[PDB]
Amino acid sequence: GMLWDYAQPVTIRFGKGRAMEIKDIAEAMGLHDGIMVTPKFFVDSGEAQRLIDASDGAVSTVFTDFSPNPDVTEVDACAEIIRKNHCEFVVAMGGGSAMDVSKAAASICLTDDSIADYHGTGKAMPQKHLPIIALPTTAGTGSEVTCVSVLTNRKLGKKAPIVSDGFFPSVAIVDPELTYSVPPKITASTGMDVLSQAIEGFWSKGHQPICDSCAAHAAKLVFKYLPIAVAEPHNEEAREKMCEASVIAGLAFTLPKTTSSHACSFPLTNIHGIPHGEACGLTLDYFARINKDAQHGRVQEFARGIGFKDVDAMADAIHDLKVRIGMRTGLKDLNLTEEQIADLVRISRHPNLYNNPVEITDDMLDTMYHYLASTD
Amino acid sequence: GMLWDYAQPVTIRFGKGRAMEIKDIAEAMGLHDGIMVTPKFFVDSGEAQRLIDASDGAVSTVFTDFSPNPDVTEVDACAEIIRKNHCEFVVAMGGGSAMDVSKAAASICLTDDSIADYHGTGKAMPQKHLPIIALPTTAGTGSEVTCVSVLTNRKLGKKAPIVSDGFFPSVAIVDPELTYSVPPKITASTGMDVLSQAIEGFWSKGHQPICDSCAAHAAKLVFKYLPIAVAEPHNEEAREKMCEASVIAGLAFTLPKTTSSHACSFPLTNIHGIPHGEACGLTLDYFARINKDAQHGRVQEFARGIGFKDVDAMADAIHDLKVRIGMRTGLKDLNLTEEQIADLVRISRHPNLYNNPVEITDDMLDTMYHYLASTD
Ligand SMILES: NC(=O)c1ccc[n+]([C@@H]2O[C@H](COP(=O)([O-])OP(=O)(O)OC[C@H]3O[C@@H](n4cnc5c(N)ncnc54)[C@H](O)[C@@H]3O)[C@@H](O)[C@H]2O)c1
Ligand SMILES: NC(=O)c1ccc[n+]([C@@H]2O[C@H](COP(=O)([O-])OP(=O)(O)OC[C@H]3O[C@@H](n4cnc5c(N)ncnc54)[C@H](O)[C@@H]3O)[C@@H](O)[C@H]2O)c1
């Protein structure tokens, strides 16, 4: 017997030049006076003002004060702006960081309580929220189809996600044109994040068939088009394909969740400043050679479906992919101490690690990090 | 570039024995007193009361007065029942016929007009309705994840579908136990209906990547388990695997729509009484040999993705599948006249026919129908 649930209530509009259709959603939903949460890059580049003028007065205010690693203070700061201008909907035009505070601010601006009162403290988020129109500009994190908002508390040293049914965006416009301006180094990291969510989402203990079809489709696209997009940022086909894999791979991690590589990326990112997708890719092919034979050859069928002889052949491609696009293949330059390696193992015992098809023991993490700390 | 919209607002609770969870959905929504629209077979078998008592007062009334091809009068008869008993939600436990009157009667009971006032005339349905909990009992048509309600106007001699966003069921519980009681002949016909909507849904003109990932997963499951479900009606795994492919193929054809085998199946059913799934599969392999080199080798990559050397190897698998499960391979026993063959050509020119990649001219229809008239 196989039991599973599937819920995906985010409408998706895909196509180049469809970011101008924000006026079509604010008129159909009957919503005026919107706030666009976008990084300051799009403000100085005129791309933000181009869509606001196209919306024809639908969007009024703009909020750009937030970090790539967003804090709980920028969420309440964005919530205060919504409370003042009486904003009805929230536009999230950015990467995984601009869309993280948009989900949190749209639900918290309807209460007089801080966003910290629900940040990993057991308190459930109020489901009442403003509508969200996610416009991802990186390909990506797939956050435009998830109910997750990853935040940080600098004054309290806390960093934990918040999962609420009210964080689901109503509409998510995936425009590949907004990804043209992504630098090659970020394109490679965000591309590895798509590949990690696709592979981890498949071999997860909470897998389901609808997510597997999306996971296999997105993974094959990353192996083919991601090197092209890194080398050629203006390649319209390679960018559009990466957006295709990005939103589709997001549909494979919302329910089955992620496993080992995402559990190890949290210490590799927060402690050592390694970007998220690059930290996940740092251990992707490592756990692949471990889970290759689990689930009665199910992972072997995944590799053959995307065009590989075995899983070890697929793990070789993941390694050749990271080298060609300039991603980390080791941690020898960090000069990690035995205390730091032991810190990597203790913090890697995350709830996501238990979703791995093969039980990862502490002796395995100690072997992996000692191998990573001794590799260029 | 690629342009496509994706909207799947149905919640899928898949699992063996999860039909008892009507109480959970009614309690979570805080709803009581529901009307269960089901065929009379499930009442005579006690399966309807097993779920009424499992809901523990959540479901109160039962409606069983509708034909396999549902008439508008049977909808208003069910609508007036909800008006006289004020039910709060609709339970659709049955085939496509039961899930097509549950969509119309849930929206028309809130009004005072007849459901025929929106049947083919073009008048939009009111977007206010009662919640729908779809419990499909075949595998299938996927009506639990679509917004179309195929009806029939017997007094007016018309059979036209109705498409309304308010017809989307809230939750679609897919339980393979409800399919154990399907006779092998109906299993084979409904089984071919899944493979049709998957193959047609893939090579359609309005194809999109999310639906194509689902189309390949569903098609690969039918080739392996459909003969098992036919020769072994109580095979639990074969039944579950057919239920899995049926709901996944529902998401595959709801947006890209159907192509030629569905356009040719409508005259094969209303005039000659051939079941829908059997009438679709009667021409499915014929159009495959036409669309093999279409869309720049796209259908070729589809056949290799599911495990065939080419479409020709897949077309042979379709033929051998129908012979093993006892589906029509020709129309020689009908002894069709030259008038009848030309009558099938006229009616087969349906709007869904133009969705085929290769153009289906009237001469190709005349050639195909004359070929089937000479085939056993
Ligand atoms: N919410 C979720 O479900 C989810 C899932 C995974 C990761 N995340 C979090 O999301 C963040 C990652 O998001 P990311 O992977 O998009 O990077 P990002 O958006 O965090 O930061 C990327 C940087 O690129 C800059 N940039 C320059 N030109 C750009 C352009 N043309 N388009 C977009 N950005 C441009 C942005 O200003 C930003 O500083 C991490 O903090 C990660 O933890 C969230
Ligand atoms: N709305 C949609 O998305 C969609 C898609 C395809 C077809 N359809 C329509 O739906 C109908 C076809 O649905 P179907 O293929 O289920 O045909 P159908 O609805 O006739 O199947 C129901 C019949 O199956 C028989 N049956 C015997 N044992 C059964 C059992 N144990 N469980 C269920 N039924 C049993 C009964 O006679 C019952 O009337 C047609 O009217 C077709 O046009 C709708």
Author numbering:
A (entry chain B), B (entry chain A): 0 to 375
From the paper:
Here we report the biochemical and structural characterization of this M-ADH enzyme, which we refer to as BkTauF. We demonstrate that it is a novel sulfoacetaldehyde reductase, which differs from BwSarD in active site residues and metabolic function. BkTauF catalyzed both sulfoacetaldehyde reduction and isethionate oxidation, as measured using a continuous spectrophotometric assay monitoring the decrease/increase in absorbance at 340 nm due to consumption/production of NAD(P)H. The optimal reaction pH for sulfoacetaldehyde reduction was 7.5, while that for isethionate oxidation was 10.0. Each monomer consists of an N-terminal domain (α1–α5 and β1–β9; residues 1–178) with Rossmann fold, and a C-terminal helical domain (α6-α14; residues 179–375), similar to other structurally characterized M-ADH enzymes.
Crystal structures of BkTauF, both in the apo form and in complex with the NAD+ cofactor, were solved at 1.9 and 3.0 Å resolution, respectively. The apo and NAD+-bound structures are nearly identical, with RMSD of 0.37 Å over 375 Cα atoms. The cleft between N-terminal domain and C-terminal domain accommodates the protein active site containing NAD+ and the catalytic divalent metal ion. The electron density is well defined for NAD+, which is bound in a configuration similar to that in other M-ADH enzymes. Out of the four monomers in the asymmetric unit, only one contains the catalytic Zn(II) ion, coordinated to Asp192, Gln196, His261 and His275. Although both NADH and NADPH could serve as substrates, the KM for NADH was ten-fold lower than that of NADPH, suggesting a preference for NADH as the reductant. The position of isethionate is constrained by the requirements of the M-ADH catalytic mechanism, which requires coordination of the hydroxyl O-atom to Zn2+, and hydride transfer from C1 of isethionate to C4 of the NAD+. We identified Phe252, Thr257 and Phe265 surrounding the active-site cavity as potential substrate-interacting residues. Activities were almost completely abolished in the T257A and F265A mutants, while the F252A mutant retained approximately 28% of the WT activity. Determination of the crystal structure of BkTauF in complex with NAD+, together with mutagenesis of active site residues, enabled us to better understand the structural requirements for substrate binding and catalysis.
